[PDB]
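Recap slide: BETA2-GLYCOPROTEIN-I, sequence and predicted structure.
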Amino acid sequence: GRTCPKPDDLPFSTVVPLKTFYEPGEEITYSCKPGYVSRGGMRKFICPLTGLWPINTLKCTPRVCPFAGILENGAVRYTTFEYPNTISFSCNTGFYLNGADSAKCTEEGKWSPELPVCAPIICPPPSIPTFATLRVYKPSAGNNSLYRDTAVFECLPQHAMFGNDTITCTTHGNWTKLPECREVKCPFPSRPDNGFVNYPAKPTLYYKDKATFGCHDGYSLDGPEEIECTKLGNWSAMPSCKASCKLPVKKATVVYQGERVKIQEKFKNGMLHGDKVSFFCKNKEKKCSYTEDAQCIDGTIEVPKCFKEHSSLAFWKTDASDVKPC
Ligand SMILES: *[C@@H]1O[C@H](CO)[C@@H](O[C@H]2O[C@H](CO)[C@@H](O[C@@H]3O[C@H](CO[C@@H]4O[C@H](CO)[C@@H](O)[C@H](O)[C@@H]4O)[C@@H](O)[C@H](O[C@@H]4O[C@H](CO)[C@@H](O)[C@H](O)[C@@H]4O)[C@@H]3O)[C@H](O)[C@H]2NC(C)=O)[C@H](O)[C@H]1NC(C)=O
Ligand SMILES: *[C@@H]1O[C@H](CO)[C@@H](O[C@@H]2O[C@H](CO)[C@@H](O[C@@H]3O[C@H](CO)[C@@H](O)[C@H](O)[C@@H]3O)[C@H](O)[C@H]2NC(C)=O)[C@H](O)[C@H]1NC(C)=O
Ligand SMILES: *[C@H]1O[C@H](CO)[C@@H](O[C@H]2O[C@H](CO)[C@@H](O)[C@H](O)[C@H]2NC(C)=O)[C@H](O)[C@H]1NC(C)=O
Ligand SMILES: *[C@H]1O[C@H](CO)[C@@H](O)[C@H](O)[C@H]1NC(C)=O
């Protein structure tokens, strides 16, 4: 007699019992693999006497979990909400993912784990470090603060801050490291020789306290006119009063700050400490002029040896200042 051959292998199905051949009368059963369903309902067949399995209308397709394209305030990386695909989630900035970051479409046709949700990241109101007060804070959400919000602290009078004065509301619901408010004092500043110094009239001096200096006519300051009590208990700087220099020569064109000037004119009232200048002097041989420097260093200034000061009443030898450059 005849016999039916092995059954055609249908997509996403299972046949039972699956033999390579059947006797007329035997029965087999197609079933969609788990995670699939059929536009039909599980087809069974009995091997005909002809030995030819009938036409199979069985079509199995993936069960489809519920639409999950939208994630309020977030992104949903997906392909097709059908078994056994995986879909992942994430939230826009400001929000955190309250739930699993991904989920699969189970063979049952539901999402596992249950779809997550994006939620607003928040920090509770911040604390005030000792000896400080924050003047930059206002709840953005209820009694609390939202992501990347800020609060700014300013220490208390006579107290120095250590660490940024500004804190932000991090993704961890907590704020960034807080600043410190220690109290700092500075010793009184020493008066400068040939000069004087001033500062608040009180028992002790603390952080951010100002002290000003100066010098008697003959001298000038070699440091800033004003200084303050730094957070490290010492001062901005300690200026001294340095002696000015009398004009080195009677008449001469010199370079002061890259420009030519009449030295007797520029420093009519003497040169201050530090003032630098450049003298001109020719190079006999090549008949051109070059320049060397000099500077007022506390009452003294070394005019270059190469310099030659021609007298006003002589003039008859051209000045180095007027010789072509070298
Ligand atoms: C805001 O809120 C956060 C809570 O979520 C909080 O936590 C974060 O910051 C803390 C530290 O402040 C973190 O804990 C530390 O993590 C360090 C880095 O992690 C390591 O992990 C890697 C794994 O990849 C290992 O390879 C490393 O060896 C290491 O273990 C870690 O080094 C710290 O460990 C210590 O090391 C010390 C060294 O001398 C030891 O004394 C000490 O005993 C310990 O061994 C510590 O674990 C925490 O994980 C962070 N968590 C998150 C989610 O960010 C923040 O601190 C908080 N911010 C503020 C300002 O409060
Ligand atoms: C006010 O007082 C503080 C307290 O000492 C002074 O801090 C000192 O600052 C210097 C640099 O400005 C630090 O030097 C550091 O180490 C060596 C110096 O040989 C070198 O690697 C670098 O110069 C480096 O910056 C020094 O460590 C630091 N003092 C201490 C104890 O740590 C500050 O300079 C004073 N300010 C004024 C205006 O006087
Ligand atoms: C945030 O905290 C405030 C506290 O200022 C709460 O305000 C009041 O209203 C509540 C009503 O449920 C009371 O139960 C609180 O006792 C009362 N607070 C004070 C100080 O009297 C407010 O409810 C909180 N708001 C949110 C959104 O959490
Ligand atoms: C600290 O505050 C922020 C960073 O947190 C930034 O402005 C800078 O790094 C610091 N600002 C100041 C004023 O030190």
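The pocket of ligand 3 is lined by residues 142-143 (CB under 6 Å).
Residues 63-121 form a domain with the Complement Module; domain 1 fold (CATH 2.10.70.10).
(End of recap.)
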